[PDB]
Amino acid sequence: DLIIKGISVHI
Amino acid sequence: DLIIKGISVHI
Amino acid sequence: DLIIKGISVHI
Amino acid sequence: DLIIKGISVHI
Amino acid sequence: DLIIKGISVHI
Amino acid sequence: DLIIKGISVHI
Amino acid sequence: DLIIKGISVHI
Amino acid sequence: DLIIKGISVHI
Amino acid sequence: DLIIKGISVHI
Amino acid sequence: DLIIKGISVHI
Numbered sequence A, B, C, D, E, F, G, H, I, J: 001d002l003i004i005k006g007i008s009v010h011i
Helices: none
Strands: A002-005 A008-010 B002-005 B008-010 C002-005 C008-010 D002-005 D008-010 E002-005 E008-010 F002-005 F008-010 G002-005 G008-010 H002-005 H008-010 I002-005 I008-010 J002-005 J008-010
Parallel strands (some): A008 E008, E002 F002, F002 G002, G002 H002, G008 H008, H008 I008, I002 J002, I008 J008
């Protein structure tokens, strides 16, 4: 379970 | 389960 | 289950 | 199950 | 479980 | 469980 | 359990 | 349990 | 248990 | 238990 969350997500 | 969420998502 | 969601999604 | 959803989706 | 969250996430 | 969170996350 | 949190996180 | 926290974290 | 905390953490 | 804490921590 890889969870990446937030107002601005930049990968 | 790879979950990426947010107001602006940039990959 | 790869879930990508948000107001602006840019891949 | 690959789910991509949001107001503006840009691939 | 790798969780990365916050207002601005930059990877 | 690797948890990285905060207002500005820079990796 | 590796927890790194704070207002500005810089790795 | 390796915990690193504070207002500005610089690694 | 290795705990490093403070206002400005510089490693 | 190795605890290092303070206003400015410099390693």
